[PDB]
Design a protein around this ligand. Structure first.
Ligand SMILES: NC(=O)C1=CN([C@@H]2O[C@H](COP(=O)(O)OP(=O)(O)OC[C@H]3O[C@@H](n4cnc5c(N)ncnc54)[C@H](O)[C@@H]3O)[C@@H](O)[C@H]2O)C=CC1
Ligand SMILES: NC(=O)C1=CN([C@@H]2O[C@H](COP(=O)(O)OP(=O)(O)OC[C@H]3O[C@@H](n4cnc5c(N)ncnc54)[C@H](O)[C@@H]3O)[C@@H](O)[C@H]2O)C=CC1
Ligand SMILES: NC(=O)C1=CN([C@@H]2O[C@H](COP(=O)(O)OP(=O)(O)OC[C@H]3O[C@@H](n4cnc5c(N)ncnc54)[C@H](O)[C@@H]3O)[C@@H](O)[C@H]2O)C=CC1
Ligand SMILES: NC(=O)C1=CN([C@@H]2O[C@H](COP(=O)(O)OP(=O)(O)OC[C@H]3O[C@@H](n4cnc5c(N)ncnc54)[C@H](O)[C@@H]3O)[C@@H](O)[C@H]2O)C=CC1
Ligand SMILES: O=C(O)C1SCCCS1
Ligand SMILES: O=C(O)C1SCCCS1
Lengths: 280, 276, 281, 276
């Protein structure tokens, strides 16, 4: 907690991720809102005003964010990262930890940009997801060439306050992007559809959404707290001849499992593809 | 609390509820009794390790408790009601957890023995074991108003709980009753996808489960429609919208509708066989 | 109360789009038909005779359109654009605003052709759709290298009189083409099929067509005027256990959503593919 | 001067009341709506509009000259039993309920007074923006002036025409359910825009504008929708490529399936009701 005593955090970009992390960080009480600064060229988005009401300092100028922050989150779309790196590269100092949240963007490409300005930029690449907004995020991070050993420890302590966090090799991160980065969108789709199923069978929509979301939350918590395999927990629910095993059969007949595999694969591949376009 | 709880049936649900109740601190384990004809099942051993009183005699459980949970398989319910119908006192609240079984069929059995049985019907799910269950309940003909309030206070300690009209319960069964099994299937598949793309299985399972937990929590804590939360994730041209497309191309949404429908219909069908 | 009293408009091309815009502008009262000129090598066209009955001036000679006009719409098929630019490039004056409506054709390619004749051509690229003919179009536009700020404001005023209009970065226009440019065709296909459904269930075809079109119009208007997500508006229609949620299930079972995604993607990709062939040439 | 009542204070009552007041045909405070659940969001919107709210259906009847039945179809018989003795010769009774026949309504009401004036209608939520699609059929005792009055009233919030009653279940499957098909389609078109690089807000706006413009074009054209489609697609172009992938998925057949499924379910529900 001495890490966060006087630490200042900044976000280049003031959109969904910046709000989600800033909301989670302040809710966890690890950072006061006034120690957080965000910059965006369009202060007309719904997220810029939400950060304002939160007590986060805003500015149009990315150089202002760099001069204020000790830990600097890059929270812009991936194709903007090289433009921002050209713009504020001469402003990065030895004190800075540069934490890239951008999907696909490699540590190598960031270090190559910044190293033209100062020889030893401290860079950390991260992949998280929007549920950090409720402190139930899923975060992985990889440390760059010049990151100090306390840099990774500090980063893990920070991202652990808003969910699961663990260090990985960088070559896992595109796959993590396809699973837990895109994950929430798959769950929101499933919950919308489960609610439609409830409505089709006679439930009011508000109740069907509440029950479906509670069912998913509880099942996920069960798995996280169990040493048993997912299939064994499935078997615990399914009584012989009963309703659940009948419903599992219709999922299997539609290739339900294969669709989710397809989704992780497609997101991972698109992530890889976007970065190959970027480097080329 | 001076409250004594009993379980007829000492299987998965009895363990999940007793584990949840005691973890919530609303019941002491020694004030709980559970009965089963096979005193050597694994759930029986798990209940015993928790401190629960176990016995093979369903009459013992009835005489022990004030709130009596029926946690046997649905086809066993009529057998149980004939066995212990003569032992039901004015003090008892009988809470049937059995899928499909109607309040009418329970009240009909018990009323041959003593008028005005106090009956509650509930549908819950296994995540009460981690205090994140989803529970609905319907009050019977002779349940008093405080009976419903007491059961909601009790079941709210282990998850979401709300009162419903009984004719919603077979549909709830198909959604949140069977729901966890849909989620375990999806988590297994998502982890397979992670492994295909290079992740160790243990990490893929942890991330998939955490993603689903976080997304469910976001929706429960947001006023927004799940479609809008979906919109907020997917950036234009990005990985997430590409993945959502392959889900749509397979009819993902329709499979989940199919599942809730099939579970509900099977629940209705099974009770129609019981009535005949 | 808008009126461009000093603006002369010309169309290179006198086909479906020129008619739809000329009809929309004149109905909007922002231009008098006799201040519009259109050219085409085929005066034996249904659209040419329609433009004539509005009062639009017609000529077979593209140079005459250029000499008459201030704002010059390029309303020919995309592969004709380079030929057109070679033909009248020497006739472009300082006063001209060249507005290309051609699918896929880049500002860069237009400016490169015209700059060989006179530096600083003022070019605007737009993508619109046929419902401008009923003043409910969906239009986006992007300003070129030498377009002045008043040129884009003026074009947004003009094009806002026949529907929605906003400025975009040019790299969005091929995707807009696939959504709102091709979109009316998706809708006409859907309405034909919904009417077939009405007829199967016992409705006369005329009534089925009227009701299906009115349902789509009303729903689109509800979404445009609502702050709610399309999914929430969908939830408000369906009664539990009811007819609508039964019908939504059969759409989902066929991958209905995926087909519309497929369509937008296919139109955008084809639009990009065609321009790549043009610029290889 | 006309006083209007709604039995039921949900989505349809709100949409109609918002449309009528936006059209200037009724004062909000000349509308009264009743519901037992005075805690719905629709009830709060109605109260903010200035509509009179009461839990008592009898009060709505006594207030109204024109009385809309806006409860769920399975509620109509209980409603008719409850306030049948309160329907007067002056009332026009307009049922909006999906599937429910004039014959079933007249049978209940005629046990009280001999000649109840009944009109059946099917409409849709876009009356809220005064672009509804409405049909109606006149009952046995409805006067010629009653049909003209209802057409005038419902034409203030969209298209309105008289039909024979045997068309109304089919209308329900087309324009009654229709807006939901369009909302699903608009959500998916926006995902398509986002997949190809557009911001979600812009994609939603463009998709909705394209659909609105195209429907207006057809309503204002004598040409067949296939001919309007032909006018968009140039040879070898983007639009005809996209039309091909729609055809390859059976896009047309899915919309036929939807109209049929909604119509069949509407008939199936009413067969269940009249069986009871
Ligand atoms: N939303 C999500 O689900 C997650 C997103 N991410 C990553 O975070 C990054 C942003 O994601 P979102 O926040 O969803 O994007 P977003 O589009 O919601 O916000 C992006 C922000 O960048 C700002 N911006 C644009 N140009 C800028 C510039 N030149 N200088 C400074 N700010 C500028 C925009 O104004 C906007 O505020 C992406 O790289 C994405 O991969 C990672 C994890 C989850
Ligand atoms: N496990 C679940 O996912 C949920 C189960 N339920 C309902 O709870 C009931 C049981 O569910 P599970 O516990 O999964 O079944 P289970 O089979 O794990 O437990 C069944 C128990 O009943 C006992 N039993 C059999 N005959 C008996 C008798 N004559 N007297 C006393 N005990 C007897 C068995 O020995 C066993 O301990 C079913 O009606 C089910 O629908 C409801 C919600 C969730
Ligand atoms: N119709 C639509 O749905 C929309 C069309 N557009 C664009 O507008 C342009 C034209 O579209 P349509 O009007 O549908 O084509 P169209 O084929 O109806 O009319 C094209 C016109 O170009 C004329 N033409 C051919 N060679 C010419 C030349 N050398 N000089 C002058 N005129 C010549 C033809 O005689 C015809 O009048 C295309 O680039 C298309 O992408 C853009 C948005 C919507
Ligand atoms: N929502 C739509 O898209 C359209 C609905 N309809 C028809 O309108 C009727 C209702 O539709 P929604 O308003 O969507 O239902 P809704 O469920 O939103 O509201 C129904 C209202 O009935 C009230 N209600 C329940 N029991 C009652 C009773 N005994 N006395 C008085 N009110 C009672 C409920 O509290 C609620 O306010 C249905 O028959 C439906 O078929 C027809 C055309 C379009
Ligand atoms: O195992 C089954 O099939 C039944 S058990 C009670 C809730 C879920 S359905
Ligand atoms: O018809 C096509 O293929 C082109 S022109 C119509 C709108 C944009 S795409």
């Amino acid at each position: 907690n001495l890490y966060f005593q006087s630490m200042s955090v900044g976000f280049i970009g003031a959109g969904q991720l910046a709000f989600a992390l800033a909301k989670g960080f302040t809710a966890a009480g690890v950072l006061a809102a006034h120690k957080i600064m965000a910059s965006s060229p369009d202060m007309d988005l719904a997220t810029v005003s939400a950060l304002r009401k939160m007590g986060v300092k805003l500015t149009p100028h990315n150089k202002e964010t760099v001069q204020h922050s000790d830990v600097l989150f890059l929270a812009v779309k991936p194709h903007i990262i090289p433009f921002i790196l050209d713009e504020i590269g001469a402003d990065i100092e030895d004190r800075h930890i540069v934490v890239s949240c951008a999907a696909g963007v490699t540590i190598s490409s960031i270090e190559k940009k910044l190293s033209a300005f100062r020889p030893a930029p401290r860079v950390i690449r991260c992949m998280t997801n929007t549920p950090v907004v409720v402190r139930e995020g899923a975060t992985v991070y990889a440390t760059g060439t010049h990151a100090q050993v306390e840099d990774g420890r500090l980063m893990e302590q920070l991202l652990s306050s808003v969910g699961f966090c663990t260090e990985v090799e960088e070559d896992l991160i595109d796959a993590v992007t396809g699973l837990s980065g895109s994950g929430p969108a798959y769950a929101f789709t499933a919950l919308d559809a489960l609610a439609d199923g409830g409505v089709k069978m006679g439930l009011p929509r508000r109740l069907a959404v509440r029950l479906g979301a509670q069912a998913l939350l509880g099942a996920a918590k069960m798995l996280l707290h169990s040493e048993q395999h997912p299939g064994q927990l499935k078997d615990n629910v399914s009584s012989p001849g009963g309703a659940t095993i009948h419903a599992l059969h219709v999922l299997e007949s539609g290739g339900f499992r294969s669709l989710l595999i397809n989704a992780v694969e497609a997101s991972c591949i698109r992530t890889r593809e976007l970065q190959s376009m970027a480097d080329q």
